[PDB]
A and B are shown apart, each in its own frame.
Chain A
Amino acid sequence: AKVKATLGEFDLRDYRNVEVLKRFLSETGKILPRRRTGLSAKEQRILAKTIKRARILGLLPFTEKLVR
């Protein structure tokens, strides 16, 4: 179940797109691997950077506690 296939068009540089960016994060808060997002090398780099900016603004989290 790859995340990119679950979404139409989105801008990989929109650091404020909280509701799209948040899907690329594991339930524990981490940036998901390319195997689980379905992005190529080139676009995974843009995603990772954008997530990081959004983290600094407080939109996305840096870490979440794992609930069993």
Chain B
Amino acid sequence: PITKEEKQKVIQEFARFPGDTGSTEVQVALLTLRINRLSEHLKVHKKDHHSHRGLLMMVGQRRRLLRYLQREDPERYRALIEKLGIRG
């Protein structure tokens, strides 16, 4: 799975301030971490449709946060997706 270290590294890199843990940035970053590991998982495990439902649910979650961050701060929105390789 995803180690505890790996997750903290992601939180540090996107935290808006010292102890920040649930910012829209930190949320889109953590979901992106899971989305990309599930996508790679599903490429080999093409018949794992049940876990694929988890993917759609994640992607929809990240999408709603991104639309929120786009409505509140367009600059912060564009930088987050560019910092993560999103929107294609």
Query: CB atoms of A and B under 8 A apart anywhere in the complex?
Result: no
Residues of B within 8 A of A (CB): none
Residues of A within 8 A of B (CB): none
